[PDB]
């Protein structure tokens, strides 16, 4: 047992809202199993989503966020988190802003991962092509033969 004021309920609900929120923004195929939740928690998810949408239309923020280097993203996360709350104040807007920042690190890490995956997979593909297909492709007179094949 334990009401909304218990540390357990706070961590539990906190996990749900944050995951709901990050998954939501990271969807904008291969999608994610949405986070099942109650009526009040949906109402909260809904509102977080709106605040996040409004943050996305803040061009200053998006500029600086894209500007920052996420080679060591954990360092960045903790440095920003600490700086945000260092003046000893707390309010709901900063908590929301923190959640927003977390979702942006996800996207940012994802962005650096994409060209890595591509290069790796291209490596396999071009290795296969060179050792198995090159002979046949030369027989066509190179990729100019694919032009003919498409009609162009």
């Amino acid at each position: 047992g334990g009401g909304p004021t218990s540390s357990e309920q706070i961590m539990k609900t906190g996990a749900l809202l944050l995951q709901g929120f990050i998954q939501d923004r990271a969807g904008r195929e291969l999608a994610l199993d949405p986070v099942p939740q109650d009526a009040s928690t949906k109402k909260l998810s809904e509102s977080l989503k709106r605040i996040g949408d409004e943050l996305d239309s803040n061009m200053e923020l998006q500029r600086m966020i894209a500007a920052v280097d996420t080679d060591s993203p954990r360092e960045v996360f903790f440095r920003v988190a600490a700086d945000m709350f260092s003046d000893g104040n707390f309010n709901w807007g900063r908590v929301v802003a923190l959640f927003y920042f977390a979702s942006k690190l996800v996207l940012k890490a994802l962005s650096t991962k994409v060209p890595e995956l591509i290069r790796t997979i291209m490596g396999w593909t071009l290795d296969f092509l060179r050792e198995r297909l090159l002979g046949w492709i030369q027989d066509q007179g190179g990729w100019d033969g694919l032009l003919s094949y498409f009609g162009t």
Binding site: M64, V76, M84, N91, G93, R94, V95, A97, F101
Partner: peptide, 24 residues
């Protein structure tokens, strides 16, 4: 580096400011 430290403080202050303003 030294400028990245600046961008990070910046992001923080901005996030804190946006959060202070989400009230009204």
């Amino acid at each position: 580096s030294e400028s990245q430290e600046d961008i990070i403080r910046n992001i923080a202050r901005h996030l804190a400011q946006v959060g202070d303003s989400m009230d009204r």
